[PDB]
Design an enzyme around this catalytic site. Sequence first.
Site, PDB file in Angstrom:
ATOM      1  N   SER A  21     -81.479  37.388  20.715  1.00 39.37           N
ATOM      2  CA  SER A  21     -82.682  36.566  20.844  1.00 39.37           C
ATOM      3  C   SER A  21     -82.903  36.108  22.287  1.00 39.37           C
ATOM      4  O   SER A  21     -84.012  36.207  22.820  1.00 39.37           O
ATOM      5  CB  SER A  21     -82.590  35.340  19.933  1.00 39.37           C
ATOM      6  OG  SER A  21     -82.660  35.711  18.571  1.00 39.37           O
ATOM      7  N   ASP A 312     -80.090  35.630   9.377  1.00 39.09           N
ATOM      8  CA  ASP A 312     -79.432  36.881   9.711  1.00 39.09           C
ATOM      9  C   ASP A 312     -77.970  36.979   9.294  1.00 39.09           C
ATOM     10  O   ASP A 312     -77.385  38.062   9.335  1.00 39.09           O
ATOM     11  CB  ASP A 312     -79.599  37.158  11.207  1.00 39.09           C
ATOM     12  CG  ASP A 312     -81.067  37.230  11.618  1.00 39.09           C
ATOM     13  OD1 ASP A 312     -81.864  37.845  10.876  1.00 39.09           O
ATOM     14  OD2 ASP A 312     -81.430  36.677  12.674  1.00 39.09           O
TER      15      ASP A 312
HETATM   16  O1  LIG Z   1     -86.923  35.294  17.370  1.00 41.12           O
HETATM   17  C1  LIG Z   1     -85.929  36.031  17.199  1.00 41.12           C
HETATM   18  O2  LIG Z   1     -85.318  36.604  18.129  1.00 41.12           O
HETATM   19  C2  LIG Z   1     -85.424  36.247  15.763  1.00 41.12           C
HETATM   20  C3  LIG Z   1     -85.713  35.172  14.686  1.00 41.12           C
HETATM   21  C4  LIG Z   1     -85.648  35.694  13.229  1.00 41.12           C
HETATM   22  O3  LIG Z   1     -86.909  36.292  12.852  1.00 41.12           O
HETATM   23  P1  LIG Z   1     -88.052  35.366  12.088  1.00 41.12           P
HETATM   24  O4  LIG Z   1     -88.908  34.722  13.113  1.00 41.12           O
HETATM   25  O5  LIG Z   1     -88.956  36.435  11.317  1.00 41.12           O
HETATM   26  O6  LIG Z   1     -87.362  34.504  11.103  1.00 41.12           O
HETATM   27  C5  LIG Z   1     -84.461  36.677  13.034  1.00 41.12           C
HETATM   28  O7  LIG Z   1     -84.421  37.119  11.677  1.00 41.12           O
HETATM   29  C6  LIG Z   1     -84.539  37.904  13.976  1.00 41.12           C
HETATM   30  O8  LIG Z   1     -83.355  38.732  13.754  1.00 41.12           O
HETATM   31  C7  LIG Z   1     -83.590  40.125  13.409  1.00 41.12           C
HETATM   32  C8  LIG Z   1     -84.414  40.228  12.070  1.00 41.12           C
HETATM   33  F1  LIG Z   1     -84.371  41.480  11.499  1.00 41.12           F
HETATM   34  O9  LIG Z   1     -84.262  40.767  14.543  1.00 41.12           O
HETATM   35  P2  LIG Z   1     -85.542  41.795  14.439  1.00 41.12           P
HETATM   36  O10 LIG Z   1     -86.672  41.102  13.767  1.00 41.12           O
HETATM   37  O11 LIG Z   1     -85.930  41.975  15.982  1.00 41.12           O
HETATM   38  O12 LIG Z   1     -85.109  43.104  13.911  1.00 41.12           O
HETATM   39  C9  LIG Z   1     -82.168  40.739  13.243  1.00 41.12           C
HETATM   40  O13 LIG Z   1     -81.590  41.164  14.270  1.00 41.12           O
HETATM   41  O14 LIG Z   1     -81.642  40.722  12.105  1.00 41.12           O
HETATM   42  C10 LIG Z   1     -84.495  37.447  15.459  1.00 41.12           C
END
Ligand SMILES: O=C(O)C1=C[C@@H](OP(=O)(O)O)[C@@H](O)[C@H](O[C@@](CF)(OP(=O)(O)O)C(=O)O)C1
EC number: 2.5.1.19
Length: 427
Positions: A21, A312
């Site tokens: 992130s 996650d």
């Molecule tokens: O802002 C961010 O960097 C994130 C926040 C979360 O997503 P969300 O905003 O939909 O809850 C997390 O679920 C997201 O984590 C994931 C979700 F599949 O990343 P991606 O969406 O990029 O694939 C992961 O690596 O598991 C990373």
Amino acid sequence: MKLKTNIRHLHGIIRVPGDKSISHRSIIFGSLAEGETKVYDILRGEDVLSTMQVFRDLGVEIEDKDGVITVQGVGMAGLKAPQNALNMGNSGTSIRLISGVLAGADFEVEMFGDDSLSKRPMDRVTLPLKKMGVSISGQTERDLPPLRLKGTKNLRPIHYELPIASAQVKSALMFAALQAKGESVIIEKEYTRNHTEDMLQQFGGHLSVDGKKITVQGPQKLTGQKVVVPGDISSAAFWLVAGLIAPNSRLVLQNVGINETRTGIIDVIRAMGGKLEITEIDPVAKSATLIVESSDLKGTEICGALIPRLIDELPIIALLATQAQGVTVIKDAEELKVKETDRIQVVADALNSMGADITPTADGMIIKGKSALHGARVNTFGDHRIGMMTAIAALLVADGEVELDRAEAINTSYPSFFDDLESLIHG
Ligand SMILES: O=C(O)C1=C[C@@H](OP(=O)(O)O)[C@@H](O)[C@H](O[C@@](CF)(OP(=O)(O)O)C(=O)O)C1
């Protein structure tokens, strides 16, 4: 590939790779700021590389030399129309956050992703972005990628109440607000990782946080920074569980980011009776070293508010729950169904094919604990977390074999994963 099975002991020191992130945002802030930005110990998983190339395509110079990322910032209105469509690969974070980043781009661009990314909804970000004057559309009412986006020089500030606990939507809107003229207020439904908020301040930006209400004044000018990326708790999580679950084990995870909005798994391990020691706490970098030991766990309940602090980690927590005595309930996690895979269904199927007793529900799953696990073939389906979860689950298989297909998906956030595993297996 064949996964290591029937592990007898896990002992060792592991330094997990950089937080994904934060790594993503370091490139965005570095690109939007004026002056240069240098990122140290950045996560080089494929998703972060995708983000880097996207900005290079947008005209940003991003050099990776001698383990250091150097970004020559272009301003805040310095991105340029790309030669070709922007490849977001498997990165949900990339396409969603960058959709907000381009809110002020005076040109139209296309954004596509792999099979997996193309099945995830972008409506959650197009709806509010269109309120600001941005023109964005995808496939079907859910606005599935590929997306087509045209920004505007006349961005209107945003006033939005998030209908879901998404940090990505919040962040996209914050990046957009940064370009709009006037005051934007973004209200979180539940607190979610606040890395964007933290880094906006680190880069000289300003915002006001009053509980769940976030106020961003626009437009702003940012200044390049030296960014040092902390270990990813989400990656450390696979070892935290491996150490509680595998027999005769003690693992020491150093330099792990410990931001309160990301430490949900620590509270669960606690409630479940796991042996977890937290030391060498750096109160400023927000990092620490976590030490785990073979423990006998008890089931627990995971719901509302805690969810965004560990969305996650639910895949590995499920495995963790599998080893605890009794039932463990996971609810208020409908957001799982919308990840790189439906993490409720795929996780349930994967672990049930191995030891079982996981009942998938509409908003989570119910796991009845203490299952001896056995061999099975599991497919990643392009989700790195499903792969790493199976890898640790496999360590508990006393007899039989585990085949993990599409294992390369793990390089999306943890390329050296199996190297670290091997280091713990010996000694
Ligand atoms: O802002 C961010 O960097 C994130 C926040 C979360 O997503 P969300 O905003 O939909 O809850 C997390 O679920 C997201 O984590 C994931 C979700 F599949 O990343 P991606 O969406 O990029 O694939 C992961 O690596 O598991 C990373």
